[PDB]
Design a binder for this molecule. Structure first.
Ligand SMILES: [Zn+2]
Ligand SMILES: [Zn+2]
Ligand SMILES: [Zn+2]
Ligand SMILES: [Zn+2]
Ligand SMILES: [Zn+2]
Lengths: 165, 165
């Protein structure tokens, strides 16, 4: 209907079923979240059908998460959002740089930073799209940091929030 | 439902005022357009302020163009659209691959292709953005092909069309 919610268990998260790299946990009120213990290939992916959404509406897609006390190597990451059918053959993941663990210290600092939601969780905008009549297919999005030389740690993934602007 | 038009003369097109590379011509109905003869650094750039647009409205930006008989090195190109204030320090253009001169052969082919307008010109969608309160600053968009080893040729630029979705 008016947007969509993707629980963490319905996102495609690389290595998420390996307790060495991710730790599944339940937090109040009885919601399952995936905490990142340590991983070098970070990829959190989700996909929706636009046919389900209210038409003639602009939608924003946010990754809802929290940070532990000691996050690592998550100052920046790559956010991507694109219509599946609009991806040209051979093109890679063509995303944008966003900030995750870095704090916006200057009022004039440029970039997309996370926002503290009313419910105490953080959210980072992955992208934006207009749903015309729900006939343009699937929309996919992800946040990733795949630097093989760094160990990412300290992000608690709750899910993707697709909301009307 | 009121949009904005940026004629080619008002766009920032590198090398466009050197006759060796671009040719300005008047065409029916008495409009000025820029025809690319040859260039290795193709960049068609425009920028608008959201404070002048209608609030609470989603906008799409389209490059309106035509092709000569023999376009060269323009099968694919890079489209970009982003809020100026959301560019992380040190990040590149961070665009997406679109098709310009390659025609869609089979219906199952993925990617963003141009299509014909009522005025006989082609247009390719460069991106979308939501104007909330007109306080998020400017939005910049461009189509570029900056492979130094290839001469791009055969595109005729009319301008950027900014239309509410
Ligand atoms: Zn699907
Ligand atoms: Zn680092
Ligand atoms: Zn894809
Ligand atoms: Zn808020
Ligand atoms: Zn169109």
């Amino acid at each position: 209907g008016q947007g969509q919610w993707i629980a963490a268990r319905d996102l495609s998260i690389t290595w998420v079923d390996n307790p060495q790299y991710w730790t599944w946990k339940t937090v109040d009120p009885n919601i399952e979240v995936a905490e990142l213990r340590r991983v070098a290939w970070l990829d959190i992916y989700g996909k929706i059908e636009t046919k389900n959404l209210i038409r003639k509406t602009s939608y924003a897609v946010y990754l809802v998460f929290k940070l532990t006390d000691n996050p690592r190597e998550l100052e920046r990451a790559t956010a991507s959002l694109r219509f599946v059918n609009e991806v040209a053959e051979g093109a890679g993941i063509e995303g944008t740089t966003v900030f995750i663990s870095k704090k916006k210290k200057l009022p004039g600092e440029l970039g997309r930073f996370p926002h503290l939601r009313s419910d105490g969780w953080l959210e980072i905008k992955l992208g934006e799209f207009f749903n015309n009549l729900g006939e343009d297919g699937e929309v996919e999005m992800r946040l990733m940091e795949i630097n093989d030389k760094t160990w990412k740690s300290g992000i608690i993934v709750k899910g993707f929030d697709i909301r009307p602007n």
